[PDB]
C-alpha cells in the first residue's frame, strides 16, 4: 500500500504541476510548491507506511 500510494501521488503531482498556468507559478511561491515534493512526499514515501 505504501509503495502504490507513494508512486501514484508523486506521478499525479508532477503531471498536474507542469500543466498549471504561469499565473499560478507567479502567484504561488516556489517554496510552497517545492515542499510538497521535498517534505510531504518524503512523509508519504517513508513515514506514512511505518
Amino acid at each position: 500500500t505504501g509503495l502504490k500510494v507513494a508512486k501514484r501521488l508523486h506521478r499525479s503531482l508532477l503531471n498536474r504541476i507542469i500543466l498549471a498556468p504561469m499565473r499560478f507559478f507567479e502567484t504561488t511561491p516556489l517554496g510552497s510548491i517545492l515542499n510538497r515534493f521535498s517534505s510531504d512526499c518524503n512523509t508519504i514515501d517513508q513515514h506514512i507506511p511505518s
Partner: protein
C-alpha cells in the same frame, strides 16, 4: 592617500587551482569620484569588482584599501532581494531617515511602483511575497545601494533591466546628484557608453586584464583605437 582601492599585480582565480581569470590587475580608483569599468562580455568587470571585495581567491599581487576594507555598498548584477518588505529591502538594516528615503525613491523613480501593489512600501518582496518585474528588482537593489551611508558604492550593471528614461534619471538624480553631494566613491560597471562624459575615471577591461586605465583625455591619446571604437558605438567624448 587620494585613492580608495588599489591593486598591484593582482592575479585572481575563481577556481582553486585553475587558470587566472584576472591577470596583471593594476587599478587606482580615486575616492569621492566616479570610476566606470567598461568592456565586452566576460572580460573581468564583475570579477574585478569581487576581487577588490575579497570574494575571489588571489594567487598573486597586493590589494590596498585606504578607506581593513570596511563596508562597501554593493548592487550585484543579478539583483538580490530579501523576503522582507520594500522599505526593509531599501533600508537594509539602517535607521529610517524619511527625508533621505524620499530622495532615494525619487532618484530610482520607484514612487509610481509604490503607488501600486496591495500595500505600497509595505508589500512583501521576493520569495513568499508578490513577484516583481526585473526592472523593479533592479531598482530596489540600486535603491538599497544608494540609501546607505557607506563611503564606497559598487554598482554592477544597474541599467540592464531599465529603459532610457529610468537609466537617465537614475544616472542624473542618483549617481551625479545623490552620490556626488556626499563625496562618495562610486564604481559603476556599465555597458552604456553615453555616460562616459560623466565619469571621472575609466577602467577598460579586455579578456581579464586592465587594457587602459585613465580619464577620457587619456584615452584620446593613449588608446586611439578604443576611443574611436567607443565613438562608433554611440555615434569628441569630452
Amino acid at each position: 592617500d587620494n585613492f580608495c582601492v588599489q591593486i598591484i599585480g593582482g592575479f585572481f582565480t575563481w577556481t582553486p587551482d585553475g587558470i587566472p581569470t584576472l591577470s596583471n590587475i593594476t587599478i587606482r580608483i580615486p575616492r569621492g569620484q566616479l570610476t566606470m569599468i567598461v568592456g565586452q562580455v566576460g572580460c573581468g568587470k564583475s570579477s574585478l569588482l569581487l576581487a577588490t571585495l575579497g570574494e575571489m581567491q588571489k594567487v598573486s599581487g597586493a590589494v590596498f584599501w585606504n578607506s581593513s576594507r570596511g563596508p562597501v555598498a554593493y548592487a550585484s548584477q543579478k539583483p538580490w532581494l530579501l523576503n522582507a518588505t520594500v522599505e526593509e529591502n531599501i533600508t537594509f538594516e539602517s535607521p529610517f531617515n524619511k527625508q533621505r528615503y524620499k530622495m532615494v525613491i525619487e532618484a530610482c523613480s520607484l514612487q509610481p511602483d509604490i503607488d501600486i501593489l496591495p500595500h505600497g512600501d509595505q508589500t512583501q518582496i521576493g520569495e513568499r511575497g508578490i513577484n516583481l518585474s526585473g526592472g523593479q528588482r533592479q531598482r530596489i537593489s540600486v535603491a538599497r545601494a544608494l540609501y546607505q551611508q557607506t563611503n564606497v558604492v559598487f554598482l554592477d550593471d544597474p541599467f540592464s533591466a531599465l529603459d532610457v528614461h529610468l537609466s537617465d534619471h537614475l544616472m542624473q538624480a542618483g549617481i551625479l546628484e545623490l552620490l556626488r553631494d556626499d563625496k562618495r566613491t562610486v564604481v559603476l560597471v556599465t555597458h552604456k557608453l553615453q555616460y562616459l562624459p560623466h565619469a571621472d575615471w575609466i577602467i577598460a577591461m579586455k579578456d581579464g586584464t586592465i587594457q587602459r586605465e585613465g580619464t577620457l583625455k587619456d584615452f584620446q591619446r593613449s588608446e586611439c583605437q578604443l576611443f574611436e571604437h567607443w565613438k562608433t558605438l554611440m555615434n569628441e567624448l569630452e
